[PDB]
Amino acid sequence: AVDFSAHPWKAPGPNDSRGPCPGLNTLANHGFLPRNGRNISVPMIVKAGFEGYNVQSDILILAGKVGMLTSREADTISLEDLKLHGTIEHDASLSREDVAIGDNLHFNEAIFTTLANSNPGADVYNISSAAQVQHDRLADSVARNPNVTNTDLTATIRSSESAFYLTVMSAGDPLRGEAPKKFVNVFFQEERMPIKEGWKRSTTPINLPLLGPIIDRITELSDWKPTGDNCGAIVLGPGL
Amino acid sequence: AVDFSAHPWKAPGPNDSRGPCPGLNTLANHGFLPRNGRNISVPMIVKAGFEGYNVQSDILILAGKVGMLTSREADTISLEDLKLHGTIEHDASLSREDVAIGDNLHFNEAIFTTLANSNPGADVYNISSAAQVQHDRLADSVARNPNVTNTDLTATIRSSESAFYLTVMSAGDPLRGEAPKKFVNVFFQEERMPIKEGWKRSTTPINLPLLGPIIDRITELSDWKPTGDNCGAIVLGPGL
Numbered sequence: 001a002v003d004f005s006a007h008p009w010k011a012p013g014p015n016d017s018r019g020p021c022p023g024l025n026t027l028a029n030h031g032f033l034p035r036n037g038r039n040i041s042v043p044m045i046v047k048a049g050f051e052g053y054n055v056q057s058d059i060l061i062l063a064g065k066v067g068m069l070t071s072r073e074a075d076t077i078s079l080e081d082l083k084l085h086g087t088i089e090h091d092a093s094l095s096r097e098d099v100a101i102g103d104n105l106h107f108n109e110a111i112f113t114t115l116a117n118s119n120p121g122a123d124v125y126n127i128s129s130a131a132q133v134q135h136d137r138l139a140d141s142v143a144r145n146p147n148v149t150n151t152d153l154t155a156t157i158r159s160s161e162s163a164f165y166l167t168v169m170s171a172g173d174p175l176r177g178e179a180p181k182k183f184v185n186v187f188f189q190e191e192r193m194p195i196k197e198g199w200k201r202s203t204t205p206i207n208l209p210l211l212g213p214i215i216d217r218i219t220e221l222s223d224w225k226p227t228g229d230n231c232g233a234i235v236l237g238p239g240l
Numbered sequence: 241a242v243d244f245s246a247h248p249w250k251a252p253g254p255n256d257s258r259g260p261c262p263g264l265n266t267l268a269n270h271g272f273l274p275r276n277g278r279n280i281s282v283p284m285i286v287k288a289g290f291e292g293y294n295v296q297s298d299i300l301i302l303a304g305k306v307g308m309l310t311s312r313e314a315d316t317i318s319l320e321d322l323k324l325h326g327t328i329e330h331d332a333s334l335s336r337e338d339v340a341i342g343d344n345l346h347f348n349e350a351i352f353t354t355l356a357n358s359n360p361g362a363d364v365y366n367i368s369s370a371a372q373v374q375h376d377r378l379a380d381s382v383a384r385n386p387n388v389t390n391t392d393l394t395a396t397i398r399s400s401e402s403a404f405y406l407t408v409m410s411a412g413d414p415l416r417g418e419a420p421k422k423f424v425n426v427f428f429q430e431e432r433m434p435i436k437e438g439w440k441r442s443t444t445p446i447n448l449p450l451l452g453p454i455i456d457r458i459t460e461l462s463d464w465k466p467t468g469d470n471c472g473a474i475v476l477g478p479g480l
């Protein structure tokens with residue numbers, strides 16, 4: 001916010017709604033979004049992402065409104081709703097399992113290994129490592145998931161999510177496209193803003209113009225190719 | 241509510257935002273939605289469709305949230321925003337032209353001819369006529385628009401829209417899947433509820449269970465086939 005000291009991290013309780021997005025889960029665990037994770041509107045996401053991370057409305061409105069499709073309510077979601085497969089949620093996640101063969105909702109340390117072990121011999125993750133992780137995660141899904149979906153759209157969302165962890169959890173300039181491993185690991189493993197570790201909210205606005213070239217570079221380095229249908233169709237609502 | 245006396249039709253003025261949907265335009269021209277056609281949220285569409293037409297929240301939430309994707313705002317649209325090609329707006333409209341060869345926004349009497357001349361020798365449009373119109377409209381697009389998009393999704397939306405005019409503008413039971421031509425023609429040509437002509441809001445709720453078999457029947461009778469890749473992908477936001 002202005003005031004991070006008024007936004008302590010608290011572990012979610014068993015009935016606090018959490019989803020497959022560490023970004024939104026983290027905001028909830030700090031009360032930038034409701035701690036119960038319910039009745040969350042796009043305006044609330046925009047405000048929360050601005051205050052918590054300095055992520056601007058352009059990307060939060062675009063993603064937010066697509067996320068709204070995952071609930072049965074007119075204008076809000078539960079965070080857990082976002083797990084709806086094929087709206088935003090996708091195979092070859094960084095920290096979750098593919099829904100056809102596992103839990104697509106909760107953090108999974110065994111999946112996270114790949115990201116956790118990336119960019120050996122640095123204390124940062126950095127675009128080339130992000131690209132290698134994506135390549136490796138997708139290969140894992142192609143090897144082990146008979147229902148794998150991999151399209152231009154999923155590939156692009158995947159690169160966006162990598163650009164998010166690199167920029168939002170950065171030490172200095174999110175432009176640099178690298179983040180301390182100690183910040184990113186806390187972000188994923190605990191869904192906590194690593195304040196005591198030394199993280200501060202970006203003073204640079206994180207918007208689509210800033211993210212665009214980072215996303216494209218990750219995609220390009222990931223040596224990604226179409227594998228199948230390549231139809232970028234999203235699921236438009238629950239229980240269809 | 242049921243106070244239609246408080247909801248007179250007024251022609252839209254020059255600043256009043258209108259879109260490619262007669263259903264929503266008509267609600268605005270009666271002040272069930274803002275007459276200016278701006279800052280329209282899904283809750284407002286739900287309320288407006290209920291009061292004006294007895295259309296229930298199931299379909300209005302589903303379609304409403306997809307419609308929200310067409311603006312740059314967090315949780316509202318302008319009615320004209322709904323013209324964004326490839327979100328909901330589609331080729332082979334009943335009353336508008338394909339965007340690649342014409343105006344996909346405004347009512348067009350020459351296009352509407354096909355619908356207007358359908359079901360010869362009855363004073364109602366019905367499911368078989370609705371199906372023949374769709375077939376003929378699509379054939380026209382395939383003949384004259386080399387960029388035609390025709391998919392399972394567009395076919396479904398098209399059949400939904402036909403089910404809408406048949407049900408919302410019905411004389412008695414929307415279940416019957418037929419509407420007086422004098423009601424439907426006023427609906428399209430003037431974006432007015434034909435109260436003068438004798439129309440009343442349905443006393444039967446119009447919801448997905450009621451529309452579902454009508455939609456399926458229209459599709460079945462329309463001798464439909466997909467075009468090209470048959471990719472049901474929607475455009476996710478403006479100016480991507």
Ligand code: HEM
Pocket residue numbers: 020021022023024045049053055059060061063064066067082083088089090091092093094095096161162164165168
């Ligand atoms: C704006 C609204 C947002 C929505 C609706 C949203 C939704 C989602 C969804 C549904 C996923 C699951 C994708 C998957 O891995 O299968 C996801 C993943 C992710 N989100 Fe968000 N998100 C939003 C904002 C943010 C923000 C502000 C950040 C900031 C860091 C962020 C970071 C991430 C990351 C890193 C993942 C990757 C998860 C993984 O691969 O294990 N998101 N998001």
Ligand code: HEM
Pocket residue numbers: 260261262263264285289293295300303304305306307308322323328329330331332333334335336401402404405408
């Ligand atoms: C409330 C009852 C509704 C009725 C009776 C209705 C009726 C119709 C009809 C009959 C058409 C076909 C026009 C044509 O083909 O020329 C149409 C088109 C359209 N409607 Fe609706 N509609 C309703 C609600 C909605 C909602 C909630 C949305 C989105 C939020 C929406 C968005 C559209 C769009 C984008 C089109 C353009 C499709 C095209 O022809 O390319 N409508 N509507």
Ligand SMILES: *[C@@H]1O[C@H](CO)[C@@H](O)[C@H](O)[C@H]1NC(C)=O
Pocket residue numbers: 100146147
């Ligand atoms: C997953 O793939 C198998 C074929 O290998 C298929 O039978 C099954 O229906 C798929 N599951 C889903 C969720 O579509």
Ligand SMILES: *[C@@H]1O[C@H](CO)[C@@H](O)[C@H](O)[C@H]1NC(C)=O
Pocket residue numbers: 359360361362365366367368369
């Ligand atoms: C529609 O009306 C025509 C003309 O009366 C009729 O021949 C046709 O069977 C009707 N189709 C229906 C009821 O589906």
Ligand SMILES: *[C@@H]1O[C@H](CO)[C@@H](O)[C@H](O)[C@H]1NC(C)=O
Pocket residue numbers: 386387
């Ligand atoms: C679709 O329209 C674009 C407009 O630039 C054109 O390049 C493309 O050839 C068209 N596809 C056809 C004609 O099938």
Ligand SMILES: C=C(C)[C@H]1CC=C(C)CC1
Pocket residue numbers: 062063066088156157160476480
């Ligand atoms: C650039 C595109 C297609 C966007 C689609 C939706 C999300 C979540 C961000 C990227």
Ligand SMILES: [Mg+2]
Pocket residue numbers: 020089090091092093096097098104
């Ligand atoms: Mg996933």
Ligand SMILES: [Mg+2]
Pocket residue numbers: 260329330331332333336337338344
């Ligand atoms: Mg159209």
